[PDB]
UniProtKB/Swiss-Prot annotation:
O2 binds at H65. Keywords: Cytoplasm, Heme, Iron, Metal-binding, Muscle protein, Oxidoreductase, Oxygen transport, Phosphoprotein, Transport. This is Myoglobin. GO terms for molecular function: heme binding; metal ion binding; nitrite reductase activity; oxygen binding; oxygen carrier activity; peroxidase activity. Nitrite binds at H65. The modification Phosphothreonine is found at T68. Its EC number is 1.7.-.-, 1.11.1.-.
Amino acid sequence: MVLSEGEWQLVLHVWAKVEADVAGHGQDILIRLFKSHPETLEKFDRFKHLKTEAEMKASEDLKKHGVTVLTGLGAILKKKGHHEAELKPLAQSHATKIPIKYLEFISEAIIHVLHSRHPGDFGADAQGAMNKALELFRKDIAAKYKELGYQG
Ligand SMILES: Cc1cccc(/C=N/c2ccccc2/N=C/c2cccc(C)c2O)c1O
Ligand SMILES: [Cr+3]
């Protein structure tokens, strides 16, 4: 997978907006993920019993994880593909098990929330670029998974 500098700028331009409210975007993304694919919530022993969106919105553990996710992903995206240093530790956290299928689910949630919150600028071009960036992310982290003996 390869993105042009222009495509990377579309990704970083929308991410700058995410950075204006990391906690909020994080809550929206995780809630979308958990409601769409409930099995993913089972991976979090600290808040796997949350059910209503109200409870999810009031959860500090969920909010903190959302911030962790967006902060880490933001660092990865800013590397514009040269993210080996960032994927190594993340693979450690995900493969010692978060399957590729779950990464696809959260990628879908990210695209959905970005479009919902920034429809004026997050169009087909930006969505396509973000999709490529997340696809690259999943492909490369899968490689890291395999180095640890996990197929994902
Ligand atoms: C996508 C992404 C970007 C940056 C950071 C993370 C961190 N993930 C985790 C870190 C520590 C422990 C668990 C993590 N991920 C848990 C997880 C659970 C269900 C579904 C998905 C999909 C997950 O990534 C992350 O998942
Ligand atoms: Cr994770």
